[PDB]
């Protein structure tokens, strides 16, 4: 899926990272050094996530729980406990 200034301005599904080349992913090429948006580095200082705080990203191997907190592991990342960037599932 395309996204970003190169892809047309779409947002990635499950709010994944849009690389600078305009493609969606969740690995370093997309989320680290060559990320354009919803980058690992864009996680709020307070680590909250969700619609309440405008759907910000979470860092590497961290997901946005359904309670609105970024963090890692099943409790944040496994289905129904996870709202986006889910990665455990």
């Amino acid at each position: 899926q395309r996204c970003g200034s190169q892809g047309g301005g779409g947002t990635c599904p499950a709010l994944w990272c849009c690389s600078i080349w305009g493609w969606c992913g969740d690995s370093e090429p997309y989320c680290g050094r060559t990320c354009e948006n919803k980058c690992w580095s864009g996680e709020r200082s307070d680590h909250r996530c969700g619609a309440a705080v405008g759907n910000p990203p979470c860092g590497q191997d961290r997901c946005c729980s359904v309670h609105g907190w970024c963090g890692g592991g099943n409790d944040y990342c496994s289905g129904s406990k996870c709202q986006y960037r889910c990665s455990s599932s």
Copy 2:
């Protein structure tokens, strides 16, 4: 100090746990299975704490920060970041 039904009906200092014997603490006999009030099990799902949500407990090894949130580690528990149930170094 004394708290709860056996101890006067007060809340502990630093909103710590009141055991079933009416004494204040922060270890498992106080906060765990034999806890009467402000127990580890009473953390709100939304993780809020502070007086605007009526001084809820925080879970185990979590502290209420000055920002109104329960969580683990130095953002919530360290000296100047913590308002109650503070414990980290």
